[PDB]
């Protein structure tokens, strides 16, 4: 065969949890200190109406930073705007849900660096 390539586990397959986190988590960068994190809802198909509650949380912290702090915000939407960030710096974003008076695991992480302050990089 080959000398090994792309052979590393990302997330434990066959998630056996009583909950189901979001998917297709994308991290869009609006400005040096702005990042629009948009994702999709899996637990809820095209059409579905349930009488249960649910809250989506968003956390992010300096990627590859010794003294980093994990943030957390509450949003009843599938998109959150990360304001007050560091320019020319990227972080890790993730989405989750809290239903049944309990919180579930976070979904795939999304990388997205911010534009260099004092003028957005141009071509």
Curated annotation (Swiss-Prot):
Span of domain Fibronectin type-III: 21-117
Cellular compartment(s): Membrane
Tissues in which the UniProt entry reports expression: Found in axons of the central and peripheral nervous system and in differentiated cell types of the intestine. Not expressed in colorectal tumor cells that lost their capacity to differentiate into mucus producing cells.
Post-translational modification comment from the UniProt entry: Ubiquitinated; mediated by SIAH1 or SIAH2 and leading to its subsequent proteasomal degradation.
Disease implication from the record: Mirror movements 1: A disorder characterized by contralateral involuntary movements that mirror voluntary ones. While mirror movements are occasionally found in young children, persistence beyond the age of 10 is abnormal. Mirror movements occur more commonly in the upper extremities. Some MRMV1 patients have agenesis of the corpus callosum. Gaze palsy, familial horizontal, with progressive scoliosis, 2, with impaired intellectual development: An autosomal recessive neurologic disorder characterized by global developmental delay, delayed walking, intellectual disability, horizontal gaze palsy, and childhood-onset progressive scoliosis.
Annotated function: Receptor for netrin required for axon guidance. Mediates axon attraction of neuronal growth cones in the developing nervous system upon ligand binding. Its association with UNC5 proteins may trigger signaling for axon repulsion. It also acts as a dependence receptor required for apoptosis induction when not associated with netrin ligand. Implicated as a tumor suppressor gene.
Subunit: Interacts with the cytoplasmic part of UNC5A, UNC5B, UNC5C and probably UNC5D. Interacts with DSCAM. Interacts with PTK2/FAK1 and MAPK1. Interacts with NTN1. Interacts with MYO10. Interacts with CBLN4; this interaction can be competed by NTN1. Interacts with SIAH1 and SIAH2.
Note: Inactivation of DCC due to allelic deletion and/or point mutations is related to lymphatic and hematogenous metastatic tumor dissemination.
Family listed: Belongs to the immunoglobulin superfamily. DCC family.
UniProt-recorded name of the protein: Netrin receptor DCC
């Amino acid at each position: 065969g080959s000398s090994g390539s792309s052979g590393f586990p990302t997330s434990v397959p066959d998630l056996s949890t009583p909950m189901l986190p979001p998917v297709g988590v994308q991290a869009v960068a609006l400005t040096h200190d702005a990042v629009r994190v948009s994702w999709a809802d899996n637990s809820v198909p095209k059409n579905q109406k349930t009488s249960e509650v649910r809250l989506y949380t968003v956390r992010w912290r300096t990627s590859f930073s010794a003294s980093a702090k994990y943030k957390s915000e509450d949003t009843t939407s599938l998109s959150y705007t990360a304001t007050g960030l560091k320019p020319n710096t990227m972080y890790e974003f993730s989405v989750m849900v809290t239903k049944n008076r309990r919180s579930s695991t976070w979904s795939m992480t999304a990388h997205a660096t911010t534009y260099e302050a004092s003028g957005p990089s141009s071509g």
